[PDB]
């Protein structure tokens, strides 16, 4: 489930999320650059010439960072976010799942590959790999008993309890980005208050037509749906769905 300690530390160092200032973004580049190679032409240099910035200053720090302690000829993703002050933030990301599958082909393989692609390296546990391995195997397909009957339920129980623990331990930033039906603790409140992006995520959650407001709106719509088509007041959505599926 979790990669080696040295590999995880190395990944945390290379794929970092610097504190974003929160200014009005101009655009987002998703480029593919190798470690030992400096891109200054059509893929990156042309965009930096269109924008007016110097690609050399970016290539210097990129070659200073990704070149050492890296395997040669490894395609790496770079997400660059440009703000209205003509300033850019670039973040490195591991190779795409397509490149990983290509290198693997020249479930064990799929899980070992998906071990390398979490959503945030600050917490390699969340999200659970077994959910994204589904998309990994789906992309692979797009490209081209007595032990099982107990391991299925063992893994089901482990997945369920880990999902519950994640729902309980969701931090303040994740709470503001996506609502949560578990009580909030003062410890997590202080942990989220220490983070600087708290103000940015707060403004984005306060602005309407956001994902947070959409989740709140669909919660309210489900409440109204229960209040309108419920056999009784204290009706749970699970039993309501059972009624729907058994009454058609």
């Amino acid at each position: 489930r979790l990669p080696e300690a040295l590999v995880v530390e190395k990944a945390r160092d290379i794929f970092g999320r610097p504190e974003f200032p929160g200014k009005r973004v101009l655009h987002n580049w998703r480029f593919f650059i190798k470690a030992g190679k400096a891109a200054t032409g059509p893929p990156v240099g042309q965009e930096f010439s269109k924008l007016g910035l110097k690609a050399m200053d970016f290539a210097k720090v990129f070659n200073d960072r990704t070149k050492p302690h890296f395997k040669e000829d490894v395609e790496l993703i770079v997400r660059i976010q440009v703000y209205f002050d003509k300033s850019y933030l670039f973040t490195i990301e591991p190779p795409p799942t397509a490149w990983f599958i290509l290198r693997a082909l020249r479930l064990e393989m799929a899980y070992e590959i998906a071990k390398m692609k979490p959503l945030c390296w600050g917490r390699p546990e969340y999200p659970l790999l077994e959910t994204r391995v589904r998309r990994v195997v789906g992309q692979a397909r797009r490209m081209g008993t007595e032990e099982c009957e107990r391991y299925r339920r063992i893994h089901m129980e482990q997945y369920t309890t880990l999902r519950q623990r994640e729902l309980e331990e969701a931090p303040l930033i994740e709470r503001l980005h996506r609502p949560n039906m578990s009580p909030l603790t003062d410890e997590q409140i202080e942990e989220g208050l220490r983070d600087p992006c708290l103000l940015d995520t707060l403004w984005r959650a306060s602005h309407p037509l956001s994902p947070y407001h959409r989740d709140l709106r669909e919660r309210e719509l489900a409440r109204r749906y229960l209040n309108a088509r419920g056999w009784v007041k204290d009706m749970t959505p699970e039993e309501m769905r059972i009624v729907f599926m058994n009454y058609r």
């Binding site: 009005r24 200073d64 960072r65």
Partner: protein, 96 residues
């Protein structure tokens, strides 16, 4: 121009390749690029931040009233029976 080209001093910054490689890059080096050096860091600067004078406010209100009366007059201009039936059947197909 080749001598004093931009970033031409990088050959002289590092006195040795070993001394250059001794330095370790961090995410702070990436984060420092997002901060403008001369000017102060500001969140947003859009057209809504443009302050209006009294004449500009009166002109904008006049333009809004003109747009209102223009919509009202177009409600009768497009009310020619052909276009009116067109919009009516379009609304009927929308609601159906």
């Amino acid at each position: 121009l080749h001598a004093l080209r931009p970033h031409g001093n990088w050959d002289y910054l590092p006195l040795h390749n070993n001394q250059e490689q001794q330095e370790t890059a961090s995410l702070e080096l990436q984060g420092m690029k997002a901060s403008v050096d001369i000017g102060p860091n500001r969140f947003d600067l859009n057209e809504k931040d443009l302050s209006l004078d009294e004449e500009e406010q009166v002109e904008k209100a006049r333009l809004d009233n003109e747009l209102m009366r223009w919509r009202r007059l177009q409600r009768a201009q497009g009310s020619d029976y052909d276009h009116w039936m067109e919009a009516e059947t379009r609304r009927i197909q929308e609601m159906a």
